[PDB]
Amino acid sequence: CSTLSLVRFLELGLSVACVCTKFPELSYVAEGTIQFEVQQPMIARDGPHPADQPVHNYMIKRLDRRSLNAAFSIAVEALGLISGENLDGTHISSAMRL
């Protein structure tokens, strides 16, 4: 036979790049935007800064949604024995079930 050597993500190296945190209700709250800006530094230049509008140093960052998929097909003769529907008391059918 052959085993399936599993691999953990946290035990890899790439994990340094991203902070992973589980957010259970996200798919519900993902109907709207989250929309948090971050910052922007600014030097103190000499000379008086005009009394105008352009004082912005808070560019906005918006969330993007991503997913993952998989396929896990199961045969028809399997769930028959699994649910005990197509089963009888013989030793044979209690072996195929295993």
Partner: protein, 49 residues
């Protein structure tokens, strides 16, 4: 050099002025310097291109 120049830092003042429904006050802090070194006290030179 170690003591290139004196540097006097004053106190801060504000300018409380409202303009266009928004409070706009600026900060100011007067400064002053003097190079307390007889003869030259700082030299530079072009390193790369």
């Amino acid at each position: 050099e170690k003591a290139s120049e004196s540097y006097f830092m004053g106190q801060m003042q504000v300018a409380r002025t409202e303009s266009g429904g928004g409070l706009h006050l600026q900060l100011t802090q007067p400064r002053a310097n003097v190079d307390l070194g007889v003869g030259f006290t700082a030299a530079y030179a072009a390193a790369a291109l």
